[PDB]
Structures are given as structure tokens and as C-alpha cells.
Amino acid sequence: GSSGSSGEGEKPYQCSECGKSFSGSYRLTQHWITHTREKPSGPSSG
Ligand SMILES: [Zn+2]
């Protein structure tokens, strides 16, 4: 009915790498930061 890929709780500024919503675009940035310093060995995603 109202459950699945398309549910009730999606934001236009929700991270995709990890997934984190925020009240405002500007805010998102601050978060996206964690996706800059993080220095993974290699095979992480997937
Ligand atoms: Zn993220």
C-alpha cells in the first residue's frame, strides 16, 4: 500500500552515499563533508 522504495519520508536534499536527510540544502553540505576526509582502503561500497 504505502511501503517500499517509494514511502513517506523522502527529502529533496537527502544524501545518497550513506543516506541522511537535513532541513535545508546548506545543512546537507556540512554532512557531505564526512565524504571527503574518509580515506577508505579500496573495496568498501557494494
Ligand atoms: Zn552521507
Side-chain angles (χ1 to χ4, degrees):
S2 78
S3 275
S5 72
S6 289
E8 277 176 306
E10 63 83 50
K11 295 277 285 275
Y13 303 108
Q14 184 194 340
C15 191
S16 191
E17 158 152 341
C18 71
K20 210 90 270 194
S21 285
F22 297 105
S23 186
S25 199
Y26 205 125
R27 274 201 201 281
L28 186 67
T29 305
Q30 281 197 10
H31 156 67
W32 271 48
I33 301 283
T34 195
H35 303 313
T36 303
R37 71 195 270 85
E38 294 273 332
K39 173 88 166 298
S41 58
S44 287
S45 277

